[PDB]
RNA sequence: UACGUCG
RNA sequence: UAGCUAGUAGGUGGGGUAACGGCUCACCUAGGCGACGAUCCCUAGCUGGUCUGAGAGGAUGACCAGCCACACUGGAACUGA
RNA sequence: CCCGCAGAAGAAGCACCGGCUAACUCCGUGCCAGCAGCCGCGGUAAUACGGAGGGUGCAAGCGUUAAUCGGAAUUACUGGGCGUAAAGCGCACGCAGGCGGUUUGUUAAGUCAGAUGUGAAAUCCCCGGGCUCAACCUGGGAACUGCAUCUGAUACUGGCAA
């Protein structure tokens, strides 16, 4: 059954980048809009738009720089089978800083740079490389 | 400024009608010493003809690598056929410390001081092919910032 | 492989037991050499290989190869077994230390001299 | 614990002048350099990758007169120090007392300098140091004692000090026969042809 | 304040005493998975008010029998 | 009895004594409550040779601790400053 | 056996 | 090696100890432990650490130091803080 | 520890040289004698056996053996696999277990941040100091990745209510 909708979202974006898809729709939630706002903020997607009233639908307009795709490798880190909670010192950098890692901290859903600057660790959701 | 070096020569066989027939395969890598790495295979009936076909194929089919100061940028994993290969920039982690047939491509590639560890198969014809794939899909901070805006 | 399956039952690599039950895993043992033989090797090789059969000090009766050209062993001749397989003979797992208790050094030898129990010739 | 053999043989296996007989005359002229390191020395080796790494380590040890456990300890110390392990390793080999006595022109070779150091003819900072591998700190004064001053050797050695290149990190002064190790030698200040990445990679396998 | 624990009654049938299962939720040292893990405790109660299936807080005291170094403070959540 | 006493720790023919506070029936180089200074009888003729925390020593003598003859000699050496 | 190249 | 346990699990009262306590005894209740591995069997002193490892780990716990246990073998108490 | 005396005078072995693996020829032997960690050498011109010359590596040591970890991603948590190489239960139902769509409120158990107590000393690491240097000894720090308590944060997971 669906047991990890975040990894489902990242799957939608990997398979949309891999199929030269212009835009990606999915069911929407607060955590997916938080992550999507981080992705737009860090420049991996072009835009997002949440529509619907009783059944919201998140839509990510994807990016393609050259013919190549911008989101090179998006991975889900803290899956439901095994959750991964890092401190502010253990908090990893991806592609030696060239690629953010979306961590859910108590202050909100941030990146690794932003939460290492904020001085607080948390639950590391996904590597975007 | 061409900086060519051969990795592996082998004797392959064919098994015709009357006995066997033995041929020699070279496998070389050239590179200028600042990106610009190529490999060539080349096979012939004697060894110097084999290495010459290998060099001649390797001088063309040469790929750009986005080096750092003297080394890689981020840790990169390249795979080819059965041969999985890790590399780590080792920001002046002195000396090229790579496996056989990876030391050579990293040596003429112009990188100086990375850390490697090939996994899986370590056939020399596929461990390069897994270093270039690898160094090819390693991108620089002016390319990532080009992609994602800033 | 699933992490739950490893919590239920962890990984376990086997013990990889010893080639040489020289017991306690001692570097040498001593034995009495119950008899002395020559034995024909396995198929691609042919020779007569000089091999003793030894009652060790820990009870085990094991057969043992005798290195070098020519020995002086006969049936009681307390020797010092060493450890090391001769692959060409089926079932010898040990060697005798030449230049040890009742096993003289190899006669007229000049190179690789330490591993055959021979002293340095005075010159 | 030191070599004690044919020296120019060691300089002939490496293919390069290792400065092992600096002495009176000029460039070798009786070495048959390059030609025959043994009986089959006329053969080109077609040397391996292990052979080039090994042969680089042997070049450096046979220059500075160090054996393997001591060299290996220098590699461990150069590894743990902050910076560049090749350059740190040459900085550890250049701070050796017998080397600093050689660089100042007090000995003709490094073995003669090692015998000056060994035979209590050398003080550092006004204290006699008997040890070939004493590690000379920067801003030190290393000199010859009153015994073994104005002995022939050192005079002749200073005579052949002017034929060489006068190292930048020293105060060579031969009037008083005292020297000042001022700073650690930069990598660009020494020898230019040894490949220390080969010996880093040799010990890192 | 005092250090106390919470747990549920696992069985009831003993003469002015009870036994309480505690659920600590601990990460596996090798595998990094948060795993439930119990701790059954023989707990004292004067006049045995708590029955089976309850939830009760519990503090540590002097020994009162063999094992039994624990005594309740507050019975909550008895709902059947 | 707790004793402020020396405990030999240097090499052979080169002792370095660490002054500790031990239960007196322990071994010399054994179990101590706290170490409180040191005493090097050589060290060189440089700067110290001996430093020794007088506040903690005064604490333990306030508790009832005894002091061996060397530690008393060292406190009589480092009196307040010298 | 057996594959190692110049004015 | 899937069942183990009758002072066994708990209670009341008496005794006992420097001190709580089935520690012990009388009576009452019929519990307690166990697949989160009891019980049985083989092995083993434990730790700070040591060796190896890029690391995570793996092996080990000689010297040095902390704790426990033993003092020919089995048992017992006496003196004493 | 310092000074003086006499004289190079008292002071170099061990393994290896077919590939892996740095370092090659001659002679003796001829499926023998024997070598060997694996591949495998030896049945007449053996760079693999035994000797010599030569060389290579280490050096008051050097080899062999035993044992551990590494290499071994060949138990894979980091970090593997399962159509045909070993590997998908013959197929289902289902308890305990693991996991669980979406919104709001509360809690704050997990999680995170800070503080305090502790995590003995030595050892490892860093910056210094003393033995002529080094090993060694030593000063200060870092570390001991932990546990407990208190103070907070509430995004995610859990509890509770809708």
UniProtKB/Swiss-Prot annotation, chain B:
Function: With uS4 and uS12 plays an important role in translational accuracy. Many suppressors of streptomycin-dependent mutants of protein uS12 are found in this protein, some but not all of which decrease translational accuracy (ram, ribosomal ambiguity mutations). Located at the back of the 30S subunit body where it stabilizes the conformation of the head with respect to the body.
GO molecular function: rRNA binding; structural constituent of ribosome
GO biological process, one term: maintenance of translational fidelity
Keyword match Nucleotide-binding: no
Superkingdom of the source species: Bacteria
Effect of residue 13 to P: In strain: SPCR13 and SPCR15; spectinomycin resistant. Not a ram mutation
Organism lineage string: Bacteria, Pseudomonadati, Pseudomonadota, Gammaproteobacteria, Enterobacterales
UniProt effect for mutating residue 103 to S: In strain: NEA-319; neamycin resistant
Protein family membership: Belongs to the universal ribosomal protein uS5 family.
Organism, as annotated: Escherichia coli (strain K12)
Protein known as: Small ribosomal subunit protein uS5
Curated annotation (Swiss-Prot), chain C:
Gene Ontology cellular-component annotations: cytoplasm; cytosol; cytosolic small ribosomal subunit; ribosome
Name of the featured protein: Small ribosomal subunit protein uS12
SUPFAM superfamilies, alphabetized: Nucleic acid-binding proteins (SSF50249)
Entry-annotated residues carrying 3-methylthioaspartic acid: 88
Record's miscellaneous remark: At least 19 substitutions or deletions in 11 codons can promote streptomycin resistance, dependence or pseudodependence; all but one of the streptomycin resistant mutations (K42R) are associated with hyperaccurate translation and thus reduced translational efficiency.
Keywords attached to this entry: Acetylation, Antibiotic resistance, Methylation, Ribonucleoprotein, Ribosomal protein, RNA-binding, rRNA-binding, tRNA-binding
Subunit structure: Part of the 30S ribosomal subunit. Contacts proteins S8 and S17. Interacts with ArfA. May interact with IF1 in the 30S initiation complex.
Protein's job: With S4 and S5 plays an important role in translational accuracy. Interacts with and stabilizes bases of the 16S rRNA that are involved in tRNA selection in the A site and with the mRNA backbone. Located at the interface of the 30S and 50S subunits, it traverses the body of the 30S subunit contacting proteins on the other side and probably holding the rRNA structure together. The combined cluster of proteins S8, S12 and S17 appears to hold together the shoulder and platform of the 30S subunit.
Species of the source: Escherichia coli (strain K12)
CDD domains in the cross-refs: Ribosomal_S12
Modified-residue entries (N6-acetyllysine), positions: 107
Gene3D superfamilies: Nucleic acid-binding proteins
Curated annotation (Swiss-Prot), chain D:
UniProt key word RNA-binding: yes
InterPro entries per the UniProt record, alphabetical: Ribosomal_uS4 (IPR022801), Ribosomal_uS4_bac-type (IPR005709), Ribosomal_uS4_CS (IPR018079), Ribosomal_uS4_N (IPR001912), S4_RNA-bd (IPR002942), S4_RNA-bd_sf (IPR036986)
GO molecular function terms attached to this record: mRNA 5'-UTR binding; mRNA regulatory element binding translation repressor activity; rRNA binding; structural constituent of ribosome
GO cellular component terms listed in the entry, alphabetical order: cytoplasm; cytosol; cytosolic small ribosomal subunit; small ribosomal subunit
SUPFAM superfamilies: Alpha-L RNA-binding motif
Keyword Transport assigned: no
Keywords: Antibiotic resistance, Repressor, Ribonucleoprotein, Ribosomal protein, Ribosome biogenesis, RNA-binding, rRNA-binding, Transcription, Transcription antitermination, Transcription regulation, Transcription termination, Translation regulation
Domain S4 RNA-binding: 95-155
GO BP terms, alphabetized: cytoplasmic translation; DNA-templated transcription termination; maintenance of translational fidelity; negative regulation of translational initiation; response to antibiotic; ribosomal small subunit assembly; ribosomal small subunit biogenesis; transcription antitermination
Family under the similarity heading: Belongs to the universal ribosomal protein uS4 family.
UniProt-listed HAMAP family: Ribosomal_uS4_B
Protein name: Small ribosomal subunit protein uS4
Curated annotation (Swiss-Prot), chain E:
GO molecular function annotation: rRNA binding; small ribosomal subunit rRNA binding; structural constituent of ribosome; zinc ion binding
Top-level taxonomic group: Bacteria
GO CC terms in record: cytoplasm; cytosolic small ribosomal subunit
Example of a GO biological process term: cytoplasmic translation
Classification via InterPro entries: NA-bd_OB-fold, Ribosomal_uS17, Ribosomal_uS17_bact/chlr, Ribosomal_uS17_CS
Pfam families in UniProt: Ribosomal_S17 (PF00366)
Keyword terms: Antibiotic resistance, Ribonucleoprotein, Ribosomal protein, RNA-binding, rRNA-binding
Disulfide bonds: none
Function noted in UniProt: One of the primary rRNA binding proteins, it binds specifically to the 5'-end of 16S ribosomal RNA. Also plays a role in translational accuracy; neamine-resistant ribosomes show reduced neamine-induced misreading in vitro.
Other remarks in the entry: The strain missing both S17 and L29 grows very slowly and has a rather unstable temperature-sensitive phenotype.
Subunit structure as annotated in this protein's UniProt entry: Part of the 30S ribosomal subunit.
Recorded family membership: Belongs to the universal ribosomal protein uS17 family.
Name of protein: Small ribosomal subunit protein uS17
Classification of source organism: Bacteria, Pseudomonadati, Pseudomonadota, Gammaproteobacteria, Enterobacterales
């Amino acid at each position: 059954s669906m047991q990890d909708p975040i990894a489902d979202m990242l799957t939608r974006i990997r398979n949309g980048q891999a199929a030269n898809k212009a835009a990606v729709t999915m069911p929407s939630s607060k955590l997916k809009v938080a992550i999507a706002n981080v992705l737009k903020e860090e420049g991996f997607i072009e835009d997002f738009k949440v529509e619907g009233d009783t059944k919201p639908e998140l839509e990510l307009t994807l990016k393609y720089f050259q013919g190549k795709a911008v989101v090179e490798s998006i991975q889900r880190v803290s899956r439901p089978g095994l959750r991964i909670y890092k401190r502010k010192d253990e908090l990893p950098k991806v592609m030696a800083g060239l690629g953010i890692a979306v961590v859910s901290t108590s202050k909100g859903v941030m990146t690794d740079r932003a939460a290492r600057q904020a001085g607080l660790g948390g639950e590391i959701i996904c590597y975007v490389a | 400024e061409l900086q060519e070096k051969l990795i592996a020569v082998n004797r392959v066989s064919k098994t015709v009608k009357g006995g066997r027939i033995f041929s020699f395969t070279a496998l070389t890598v050239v590179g200028d010493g600042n990106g610009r790495v190529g490999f060539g295979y080349g096979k012939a009936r004697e060894v110097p003809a084999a290495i010459q076909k290998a060099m001649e194929k390797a001088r063309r089919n040469m790929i750009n690598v986005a080096l750092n100061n003297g080394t890689l940028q981020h840790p990169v994993k390249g795979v080819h056929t059965g041969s999985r290969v890790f590399m780590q920039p080792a920001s002046e982690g002195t000396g090229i410390i790579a496996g056989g047939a990876m030391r050579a491509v990293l040596e003429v590639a112009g990188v100086h001081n990375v850390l490697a560890k090939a996994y899986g198969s370590t056939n020399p014809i596929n461990v390069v092919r897994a270093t270039i794939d690898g160094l090819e899909n390693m991108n620089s901070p002016e390319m990532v910032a080009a992609k994602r805006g800033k | 492989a699933t992490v739950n399956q490893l919590v239920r039952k962890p990984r376990a690599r086997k013990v990889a037991k010893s080639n040489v039950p020289a017991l306690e895993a001692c570097p040498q043992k001593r034995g009495v050499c119950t008899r002395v033989y020559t034995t024909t090797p396995k198929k691609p090789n042919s020779a007569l290989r000089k091999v003793c059969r030894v009652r060790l000090t820990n009870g085990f009766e094991v057969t043992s190869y005798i290195g070098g050209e020519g020995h002086n062993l006969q049936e009681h001749s307390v020797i010092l077994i060493r450890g090391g397989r001769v692959k060409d003979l089926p079932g010898v797992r040990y060697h005798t230390v030449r230049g040890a208790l009742d096993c003289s050094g190899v006669k007229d030898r000049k190179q690789a001299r330490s591993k055959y129990g021979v002293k340095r010739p005075k010159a | 614990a030191r070599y004690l053999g044919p020296k120019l043989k060691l300089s002939r296996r490496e293919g390069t002048d290792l400065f092992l007989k600096s002495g009176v005359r000029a460039i070798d002229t009786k070495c048959k350099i390059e030609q025959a390191p043994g009986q089959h020395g006329a053969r080109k080796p077609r040397l391996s990758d292990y052979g080039v790494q090994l042969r680089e380590k042997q070049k450096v040890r046979r220059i500075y007169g160090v054996l393997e456990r001591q060299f290996r300890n220098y590699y461990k110390e150069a590894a743990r120090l902050k910076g560049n392990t090749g350059e740190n390793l040459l900085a550890l080999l250049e701070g050796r007392l017998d080397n600093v006595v050689y660089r100042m022109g007090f000995g003709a070779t490094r073995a003669e300098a090692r015998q000056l150091v060994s035979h209590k003819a050398i003080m550092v900072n006004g204290r006699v140091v008997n040890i070939a591998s004493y590690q000379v700190s920067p801003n030190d004064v290393v000199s010859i004692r009153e015994k073994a001053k104005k002995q022939s050797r050192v005079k002749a050695a200073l005579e052949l000090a002017e034929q060489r290149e006068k190292p930048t990190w020293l105060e060579v002064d031969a009037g008083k026969m005292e020297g000042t190790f001022k700073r650690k030698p930069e990598r660009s200040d020494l020898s230019a042809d040894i490949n220390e990445h080969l010996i880093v990679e040799l010990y890192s396998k | 304040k005092i250090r106390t624990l919470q747990g549920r009654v696992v069985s009831d049938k003993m003469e002015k005493s009870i036994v309480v299962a505690i659920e600590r939720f601990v990460k596996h040292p090798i595998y990094g998975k948060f795993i439930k893990r119990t701790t059954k405790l023989h707990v004292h109660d004067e006049n045995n008010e708590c029955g089976i299936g309850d939830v009760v807080e519990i503090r540590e005291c002097r020994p009162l029998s063999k094992t039994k170094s624990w005594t309740l403070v507050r019975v909550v959540e008895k709902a059947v | 009895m707790v004793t402020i006493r020396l405990a030999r720790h240097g090499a052979k023919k080169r002792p370095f004594y660490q002054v500790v506070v031990a239960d007196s029936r322990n071994a010399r180089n054994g179990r101590f409550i706290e170490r409180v200074g040191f005493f090097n009888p050589i060290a060189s003729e440089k700067e110290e040779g001996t430093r020794l925390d007088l506040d903690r020593i005064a604490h333990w003598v306030g508790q009832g601790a005894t002091i061996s003859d060397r530690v008393a000699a060292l406190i009589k050496e480092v009196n307040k400053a010298a």
